[PDB]
């Protein structure tokens, strides 16, 4: 009669809570937060679990009895308890405990509080934690059903416990019980307890390891139901201290290589995945006998499901090549400021693994057969070669696609580890795959592509017509027509085929080119972006070779077409400009009949972005925030023109204000911009120093300030830029040595510094020294070691050449500064294949210098203990 006309008010607030909408929202939020003041009713208007359910609604009551209730934990978590400490109010609900069954749903809608109201009152670990045992083995069938009331809480222990020697020696005699509740016929009662009787750490890592019985009491504990045998097959292959597995181990692998097979897909994933977790070596002593015991099942998983096949086939049916690409399918793309680097012969992994943007979504089994098979070339190699052929021999024609595909996949799936040994059959497979590409197996051509390329390296390191000519012929037919899925797999592949053949494609240019040029007329947005990338790659590979009227004349028109079509805000500019940026460098001077506007666009973009920034900084309300990426891309393209046109760009620069735009960019508050400008100052310095020189007194100190390894990439380009500047101005460099030399010698000896930064630093120090021997020479013993160690691995070229001219020069001014480490230099010298006679004669002197230091016999003997190649090169430089 008192709070009775009020409780029938919650039966009303739940008729708005449950069925909530905009009004009820911002409106009911008042009534719900005004009933937290007259707290003489909530402490009562809560028991409403078997009161409100057992009153009117069901779904609605549970939304307060299980609903609003939980919102009080917030009133105890956020309070420290001085509010409501009351133990009746505490035991009033700690009494609802023995009410585990009023509609199994509501049979837990309160049991999570038993975790909350224990984390905000952890002490007192026994008045409530008494139900622990006071219901523990109670689930042994003792309520509505047997467990359908007692079990509807046994699980509420897994949650309250795991989700929440003080008391380390008390709980042991309780958690050992859980092993019991296992052979029960009930699902929950089996698993609910089980997977939970496996969440182990250190809090009481006792009964655990000692159990070799819960190994076989489970090594046979198959599907007590279904949704459990999975969380079971989740724990065995879930451990680190495999001291006890070592024993029962040649069975776990047997009662597993099949539990990953159990038809219920969800299980196999929890198995296969958690299974092939081949950590350290010992995990392959077993895989030895397991060569045939798994390379049939996994292989037979390497095929798509009937549905992952459905979800695919969608945009598979070659007839979408004319369907526009949705804007919601254009993954955001950015521009990374160019980093000036060196080359190391035919020697990626530290760049391509930074882009696992897809696989992270579709985690079926297929992305785990091969995904776990990612060990049979990481742990061992060519071990699988034998026996797999017949699998992949029939597979390559057996049945329809699903299987053929699983074959063409596995093939490429292994080449990066089982290569050499595979190379043997390689001369027969390859010309075949080249057939697959020509099928009608749309989703098969895809992997035919990715696979061919997967190991085309070989096809290139072979005779032409044999197959590097036909491959590049059918691969190209795929670049076109087909479905868009094919098109991508196509290009991306060929894209790699290029980077490989580098300069060997030159013969079949006109051809390759017309394939690409036609694509621009058939490709959709999504693929067009890869088309751009393709071309830029082709250009980087072929080199100046691309500079010929016939080629240029058919490649530009399509690019110009795009160029005039994009707003200065369209992100496609990145791919397009990045492409150009390349092409422009390959056409060297041959791009002239195009540079003025390319140049102009860049300068203007930098000019617009710099402004857009300031305006946005001051009036965020009015002007939007510019994306500095357009500066970086433009800066990088100007840096590309200057390299290709080099010198011919003199005029353009003179009538523009890049030099002014430099002060602005080298001073920008964003690293990448700063990084790109330096790459430019460097190239400009090579092309038209005449125009830079006047600002050297300004710029120099700026660069000095940027030799801060706090942003290596910026440091890297500033370093290289100082190197090219010192060469353009000889001894007139003398005065700027102090504000640079120290930081350089510091970096060259800086731990954990990236190769490229050490190579440039080495090179620049070389140059400064080549210009001011007296100035840098006295400090030779402070860098000569990292200097050699570093430069010995760089390709001969202009840069390596100047650097050695400088060291050689300094060595003469201060021989004593290198004698001690004379073996380091020798190796560095012997890394040269063919050097200019000029420099070759400086080597000769320094060497004879060393001979004079150790004596004819020591030098004879030393000189001889070199592996053949070096041995001869050294001989050739020395002139007895």
């Amino acid at each position: 009669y008192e709070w009775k006309p009020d409780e029938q008010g919650l039966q009303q607030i739940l008729q708005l809570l449950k069925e909530s909408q905009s009004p009820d929202t911002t409106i009911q939020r008042t009534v719900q937060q005004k009933l937290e003041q007259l707290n003489q009713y909530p402490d009562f208007n809560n028991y409403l679990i078997f009161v409100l359910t057992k009153l009117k609604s069901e779904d609605e009551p549970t939304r307060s009895l299980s609903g609003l209730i939980l919102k009080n934990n917030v009133k105890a978590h956020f309070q420290n308890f001085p509010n409501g400490v009351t133990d009746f109010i505490k035991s009033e609900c700690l009494n609802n405990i023995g009410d585990s069954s009023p509609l199994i749903r509501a049979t837990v809608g309160i049991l999570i509080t038993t975790i909350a109201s224990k984390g905000e009152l952890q002490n007192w670990p026994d008045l409530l934690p008494k139900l622990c045992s006071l219901l523990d083995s109670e689930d042994y069938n003792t309520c509505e059903g047997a467990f359908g009331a007692l079990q509807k809480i046994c699980e509420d222990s897994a949650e309250i416990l795991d989700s929440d020697r003080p008391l380390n020696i008390m709980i042991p005699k309780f958690l050992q019980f859980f092993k019991h509740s296992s052979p029960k016929i009930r699902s929950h009662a089996v698993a609910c307890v089980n997977q939970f009787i496996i969440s182990r750490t250190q809090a009481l890592m006792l009964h655990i390891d000692s159990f070799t019985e819960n190994l076989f009491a489970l090594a046979g504990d198959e599907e007590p139901e279904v949704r459990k045998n999975v969380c079971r097959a989740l724990v065995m292959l879930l451990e680190v201290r495999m001291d006890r597995l070592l024993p029962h181990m040649h069975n776990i692998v047997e009662y597993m290589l099949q539990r990953t097979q159990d038809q219920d897909e969800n299980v196999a994933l929890e198995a296969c995945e958690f299974w092939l977790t081949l950590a350290e070596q010992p995990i392959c002593k077993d895989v030895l006998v397991r060569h045939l015991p798994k390379l049939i099942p996994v292989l037979v998983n390497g095929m798509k499901y009937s549905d992952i096949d459905i979800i695919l086939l969608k945009g598979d049916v070659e007839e979408d090549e004319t369907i526009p690409d949705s804007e919601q399918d254009i993954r955001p793309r950015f521009h990374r400021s160019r980093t000036v680097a060196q080359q190391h012969d035919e020697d990626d992994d530290d760049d391509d693994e930074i882009d696992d943007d897809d696989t992270i979504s579709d985690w079926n089994l297929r992305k785990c057969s091969a995904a776990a098979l990612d060990v049979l070339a990481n742990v061992y190699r060519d071990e699988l070669l034998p026996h797999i052929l017949p699998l992949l021999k029939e597979l390559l024609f057996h049945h329809e696609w699903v299987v053929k595909e699983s074959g063409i996949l596995v093939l490429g799936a292994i080449a990066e580890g089982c290569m050499q040994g595979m190379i043997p059959y390689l001369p027969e497979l390859i010309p075949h795959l080249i057939q697959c590409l020509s099928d009608k197996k749309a989703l098969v051509r895809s992997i035919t592509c990715w696979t061919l390329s997967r190991y085309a390296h070989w096809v290139v390191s072979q005779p032409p017509d044999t197959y590097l000519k036909p491959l590049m012929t059918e691969l190209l037919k795929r670049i076109l027509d087909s479905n868009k899925r094919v098109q991508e797999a196509a290009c991306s592949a060929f894209a790699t085929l290029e980077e490989e053949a580098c300069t060997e494609l030159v013969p079949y240019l006109a051809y390759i080119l017309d394939t690409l040029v036609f694509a621009f007329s058939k490709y959709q947005h999504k693929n067009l972006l890869i088309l751009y990338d393709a071309i830029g790659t082709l250009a980087d590979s072929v080199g100046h070779h691309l500079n010929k009227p016939e080629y240029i004349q058919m490649l530009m028109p399509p690019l110009i077409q795009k160029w005039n079509m994009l707003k200065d805000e369209d992100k496609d500019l990145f791919p397009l400009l990045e492409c150009l940026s390349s092409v422009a460098t390959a056409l060297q001077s041959g791009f002239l009949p195009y540079c003025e506007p390319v140049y102009q666009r860049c300068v203007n973009l930098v000019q617009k972005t710099l402004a857009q920034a300031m305006l946005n900084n001051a009036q965020p309300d009015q002007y939007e925030a510019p994306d500095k990426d357009f500066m970086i891309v433009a800066l990088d393209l100007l840096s590309g023109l200057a390299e290709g046109l080099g010198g011919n760009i003199e005029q353009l620069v003179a009538r523009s204000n890049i030099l002014t735009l430099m002060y602005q960019c080298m001073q920008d508050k964003m690293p990448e911009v700063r990084q790109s400008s330096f790459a430019l100052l460097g190239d400009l310095t090579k092309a038209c120093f005449q125009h830079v020189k006047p600002c050297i007194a300004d710029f120099m100190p700026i660069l000095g300030t940027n030799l801060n390894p706090e942003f290596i990439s910026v440091c890297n380009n500033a370093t290289w830029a100082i190197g090219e500047i010192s060469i353009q101005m000889g001894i007139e460099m003398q005065p700027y040595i102090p504000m640079v030399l120290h930081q350089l010698v510091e970096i060259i000896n800086r731990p954990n510094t990236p190769k490229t930064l050490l190579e440039n630093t080495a090179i620049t120090i070389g140059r400064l020294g080549y210009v001011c021997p007296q100035e840098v020479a006295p400090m030779l013993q402070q860098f000569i070691r990292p200097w050699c160690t570093s430069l010995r691995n760089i390709r001969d070229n202009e840069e390596k050449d100047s650097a050695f001219r400088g060291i050689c020069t300094m060595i003469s001014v201060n021989p004593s500064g290198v004698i001690q480490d004379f073996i380091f230099f020798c190796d560095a010298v012997a890394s040269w294949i063919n050097p200019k006679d000029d420099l070759r004669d400086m080597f000769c002197k320094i060497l004879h210098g060393f001979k004079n230091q150790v004596g004819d016999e020591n030098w004879r003997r030393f000189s001889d203990q070199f592996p053949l190649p070096l041995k001869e090169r050294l001989a050739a430089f020395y002139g007895v």
């Binding site: 809570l17 449950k18 909530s20 909408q21 905009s22 929202t25 911002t26 939020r29 719900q32 937060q33 779904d59 549970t62 939304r63 299980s66 609903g67 609003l68 939980l70 919102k71 917030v74 837990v108 809608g109 999570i112 949650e159 989700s163 969800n266 994933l269 995945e273 549905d307 459905i310 979800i311 969608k314 949705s326 804007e327 919601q328 399918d329 254009i330 993954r331 955001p332 950015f334 693994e353 930074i354 696992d356 943007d357 992270i360 979504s361 985690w363 990426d629």
Partner: protein, 190 residues
């Protein structure tokens, strides 16, 4: 033609309120005017299997409604656990929602979304996202900003609900009434 209980959990600010706004609006909307009373926006997609009523429960991440935690998760049919790739935390302050969700709804389908991938400064690299692979959900890089994959969560949810992998939304406009479409074109003169 069916209503659905879709809870939009996820840390505060992550995008939830703009993300939904996107399917309702026609453009972005920057500001951050934190959500207080967990708002209920209704969404409807047109599929090859008919229409779909999705009642999006725009939850809150701030202590604006940080009071009413669960309660909506009650009798929920599907969930979207959203964070922020540009936020070190969020992806960390996440497994706390998967739980305070699986508690109530005990097996609804849930989609985990790394939002704001339209930013160069990606704090939570994809390679750092293994949750879904384990607690077995579905992942999607997305951007309420640009619309990248801004439909995938729903399509995957619908497909899981209705139980039809062949289901898809028909963005494609209408043409001639399917039952009057004339002979292929070649069947014309065949």
């Amino acid at each position: 033609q069916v209503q659905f209980k879709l809870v939009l959990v996820g840390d505060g600010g992550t995008g939830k309120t703009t993300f939904v706004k996107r399917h309702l609006t026609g453009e972005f909307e920057k500001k951050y005017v934190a959500t207080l009373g967990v708002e209920v926006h209704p969404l409807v997609f047109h599929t090859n299997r008919g229409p779909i009523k999705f009642n999006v429960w725009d939850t809150a991440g701030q202590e604006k409604f940080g009071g009413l935690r669960d309660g909506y998760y009650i009798q929920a049919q599907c969930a979207i656990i959203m964070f922020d790739v540009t936020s070190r935390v969020t992806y960390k302050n996440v497994p706390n929602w998967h739980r305070d969700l699986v508690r109530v709804c005990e097996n609804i389908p849930i989609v985990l979304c790394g939002n704001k991938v339209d930013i160069k400064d990606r704090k939570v690299k994809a390679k750092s996202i293994v949750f879904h692979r384990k607690k077995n959900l579905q992942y999607y890089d997305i951007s309420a900003k640009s619309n990248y994959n801004f439909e995938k969560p729903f399509l995957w949810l619908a497909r899981k609900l209705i139980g039809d992998p062949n289901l898809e939304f028909v963005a494609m406009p209408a043409l001639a009434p399917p039952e009057v479409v004339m002979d292929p074109a070649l069947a014309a003169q065949y």
